[PDB]
UniProtKB/Swiss-Prot annotation:
Disulfide bonds: none annotated. It comes from Drosophila melanogaster (Fruit fly). Regulator of Notch signaling, a signaling pathway involved in cell-cell communications that regulates a broad spectrum of cell-fate determinations. Mainly acts as a positive regulator of Notch, but it may also act as a negative regulator, depending on the developmental and cell context. Mediates the antineural activity of Notch. May function as a ubiquitin ligase protein in the Notch pathway. Regulates the sorting and degradation of N/Notch via an ESCRT-III dependent endolysosomal pathway. It comes from the Eukaryota. Ubiquitous. Expressed at low levels throughout embryogenesis and in larvae. The lineage of its organism: Eukaryota, Metazoa, Ecdysozoa, Arthropoda, Hexapoda. Residues 1-67, 68-150 form the WWE domain. One of its GO terms (molecular function) is ubiquitin protein ligase activity. This is Protein deltex. Belongs to the Deltex family. The chain holds residues 43 to 211 of 738 of the full protein. It is found in: Cytoplasm; Endosome, Multivesicular body. GO terms for cellular component: cytoplasm; cytosol; multivesicular body; nucleoplasm; nucleus. GO terms for biological process: endocytosis; negative regulation of canonical Wnt signaling pathway; negative regulation of Notch signaling pathway; Notch receptor processing; Notch signaling pathway; positive regulation of canonical Wnt signaling pathway; positive regulation of endocytosis; positive regulation of Notch signaling pathway. The WWE domains are thought to mediate some protein-protein interaction, and are frequently found in ubiquitin ligases. Keywords: Cytoplasm, Endosome, Metal-binding, Notch signaling pathway, Phosphoprotein, Repeat, SH3-binding, Transferase, Ubl conjugation pathway, Zinc, Zinc-finger.
Amino acid sequence: AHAVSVWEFESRGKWLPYSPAVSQHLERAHAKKLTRVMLSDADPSLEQYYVNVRTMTQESLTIGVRRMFYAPSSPAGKGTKWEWSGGSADSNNDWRPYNMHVQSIIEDAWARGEQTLDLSNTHIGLPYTINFSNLTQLRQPSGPMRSIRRTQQAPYPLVK
């Protein structure tokens, strides 16, 4: 009887998740039937990110935005996320979320004990292989290998 609401934006043909706090801010505005939202209101570093809820777009330009529902059992619903690292090897400063669906598939393969998950099968156009024994993402064919991680996160907004 419940779902969590994950707001997403378009980034290179990937529908990436906004953070829990930003999704929580967007959801409250949708609930109040508002049209315009400034994302800095929920995350002060999102400088002049303007989301129009009627056209379902974000300007900061061309970008699409959507509101998606996921189950309580998804990573979004359970308070956990899978991210990959953005710039040197054992660098921890620039982390990035995978598409929420991909996070669920990674979580599911991790939980079932897979040694490896080839994201190019599943879905896509994500030529990456995840290795759970060393927690990395390998750009096919043979790298870069970037660190991935599973961390606790706040709950996304709950819905009827």
